[PDB]
Amino acid sequence: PEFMLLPNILLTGTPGVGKTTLGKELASKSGLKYINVGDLAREEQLYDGYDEEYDCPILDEDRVVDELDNQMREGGVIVDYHGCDFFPERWFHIVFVLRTDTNVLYERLETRGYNEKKLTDNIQCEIFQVLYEEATASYKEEIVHQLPSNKPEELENNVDQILKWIEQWIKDHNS
């Protein structure tokens, strides 16, 4: 991989849409580094404050940015998070918003053991297309793409499409 310019990819979308499964499979099949922002925040303890209504530690967004910046500047990172407005715009060469039909998403999150309030908030997040709108507000329209993510076959299509995109980008940016 040495001395190749490599792209950064954002995988965003509501919890349950398949970002982690996709990012991990992409890392394995491309050699790009996969970063789960939730796991990173947990591992490096990047929390500040507690949201009492959602019942979750509040992400320290500045510290996440500081934690990742050097690595992002070096390129070749696939970032997975259910938020994107706080990342420096310069980080990402392409942004994929994974989408899952509400019925499918509900059953996924139900299986994850989400209670009613958490199920409702997340399901409304998807049905209101919150993350999609957040992505389009934060990044150039031409680099934001929605990906259906409802079944293994769509995961397969997404892996294939993005792996092909990575190859083309690398060719274009290492003349």
XYZ file of C-alpha atoms in Angstrom:
175
model
C 0.000 0.000 0.000
C 3.074 2.192 0.542
C 3.207 5.509 -1.309
C -0.279 5.158 -2.827
C -2.796 7.965 -2.329
C -5.893 6.299 -0.860
C -9.464 7.603 -0.490
C -11.514 8.070 2.649
C -15.069 6.809 2.707
C -17.871 7.708 5.069
C -20.576 5.140 5.789
C -23.471 6.842 7.508
C -27.171 6.234 8.075
C -29.456 5.246 10.939
C -28.292 2.573 13.423
C -29.333 -0.827 12.038
C -28.879 -0.071 8.330
C -25.731 -2.245 7.993
C -22.841 0.257 8.163
C -20.633 -1.953 10.348
C -21.146 -5.131 8.340
C -20.429 -3.191 5.162
C -17.390 -1.288 6.505
C -15.773 -4.428 7.919
C -16.264 -6.372 4.696
C -14.887 -3.418 2.700
C -11.791 -3.210 4.947
C -11.126 -6.952 4.537
C -11.537 -6.781 0.767
C -9.662 -3.525 0.096
C -7.038 -3.305 2.845
C -8.406 0.104 3.842
C -8.637 0.732 7.577
C -12.132 0.418 9.036
C -13.074 2.746 11.880
C -16.243 2.312 13.923
C -16.637 5.737 15.546
C -18.821 4.357 18.369
C -16.178 1.715 19.202
C -13.381 4.284 18.935
C -15.195 6.588 21.360
C -15.647 3.632 23.723
C -12.039 2.464 23.440
C -10.531 5.925 23.794
C -13.234 7.161 26.232
C -14.212 10.175 24.140
C -17.411 11.075 25.958
C -18.506 14.336 27.562
C -21.860 14.591 29.324
C -24.877 12.320 29.565
C -28.125 12.669 27.640
C -30.830 11.618 30.107
C -33.793 11.232 27.704
C -31.945 9.001 25.172
C -29.895 7.341 27.940
C -26.428 7.391 26.348
C -23.059 9.087 26.970
C -22.710 12.108 24.706
C -19.986 11.856 22.099
C -17.198 14.381 22.480
C -17.177 15.454 18.850
C -14.051 17.643 18.951
C -12.058 14.858 20.617
C -13.231 12.321 18.024
C -12.091 14.735 15.284
C -8.732 15.275 17.057
C -8.337 11.539 17.573
C -8.808 10.718 13.888
C -7.451 13.726 12.041
C -3.852 12.578 11.442
C -4.995 9.206 10.177
C -7.667 10.793 7.967
C -5.057 13.128 6.451
C -3.003 10.064 5.499
C -5.997 8.535 3.704
C -7.317 5.005 3.215
C -9.932 5.037 5.991
C -13.510 3.839 6.016
C -15.400 5.628 8.774
C -18.662 4.268 10.165
C -20.956 6.520 12.189
C -24.655 7.401 12.535
C -23.830 11.118 12.353
C -21.686 13.201 10.019
C -22.236 16.933 10.461
C -19.208 17.369 12.766
C -16.538 15.659 10.630
C -14.283 18.030 8.677
C -15.694 18.120 5.140
C -12.188 17.610 3.707
C -11.955 14.145 5.255
C -14.228 12.329 2.836
C -13.895 11.625 -0.864
C -17.277 9.928 -0.986
C -20.176 9.534 1.432
C -22.618 6.626 1.401
C -25.883 6.880 3.301
C -27.138 3.355 3.797
C -30.923 3.071 3.748
C -33.121 0.275 5.046
C -36.868 -0.074 4.542
C -38.554 0.843 7.809
C -40.125 -2.614 8.276
C -36.750 -4.352 7.806
C -34.954 -1.827 10.017
C -37.459 -2.214 12.825
C -36.971 -6.004 12.925
C -33.192 -5.539 12.882
C -33.234 -3.136 15.805
C -35.801 -5.250 17.639
C -33.419 -8.256 17.356
C -30.635 -5.999 18.716
C -32.719 -5.716 21.895
C -33.730 -2.060 21.611
C -36.616 -1.081 23.907
C -39.711 0.777 22.686
C -38.457 4.365 23.091
C -35.147 3.602 21.400
C -36.888 1.656 18.622
C -39.231 4.628 18.057
C -36.481 7.282 17.988
C -34.350 5.272 15.562
C -37.261 4.276 13.376
C -38.361 7.926 13.163
C -34.757 8.860 12.390
C -34.933 6.562 9.334
C -38.472 7.405 8.192
C -37.638 11.145 8.418
C -34.414 10.492 6.432
C -32.453 12.446 9.076
C -28.969 11.115 8.261
C -29.501 11.429 4.542
C -30.428 15.082 5.005
C -27.503 15.550 7.406
C -25.126 14.104 4.794
C -26.471 16.287 1.972
C -26.197 19.368 4.244
C -22.620 18.565 5.200
C -21.094 17.354 1.901
C -21.228 18.173 -1.815
C -24.290 16.614 -3.412
C -22.194 14.910 -6.095
C -20.276 12.859 -3.478
C -23.281 11.744 -1.412
C -24.993 8.480 -2.465
C -27.805 6.483 -0.902
C -27.314 2.717 -0.835
C -30.173 0.275 -0.300
C -29.246 -2.059 2.509
C -32.089 -4.511 3.131
C -30.689 -7.958 2.368
C -27.440 -9.918 1.873
C -27.759 -9.393 -1.902
C -27.767 -5.615 -1.449
C -24.769 -5.874 0.904
C -23.115 -7.827 -1.920
C -24.012 -5.141 -4.513
C -22.725 -2.418 -2.191
C -19.422 -4.205 -1.505
C -18.945 -4.726 -5.247
C -19.830 -1.149 -6.188
C -17.612 0.451 -3.540
C -14.635 -1.872 -4.212
C -14.907 -0.839 -7.871
C -15.129 2.833 -6.884
C -12.014 2.471 -4.692
C -10.057 0.912 -7.558
C -11.033 3.686 -9.987
C -10.277 6.449 -7.463
C -6.843 5.006 -6.757
C -6.074 4.821 -10.499
C -7.276 8.424 -11.008
C -5.241 9.755 -8.063
C -1.980 7.923 -8.648
C -1.104 8.907 -12.224
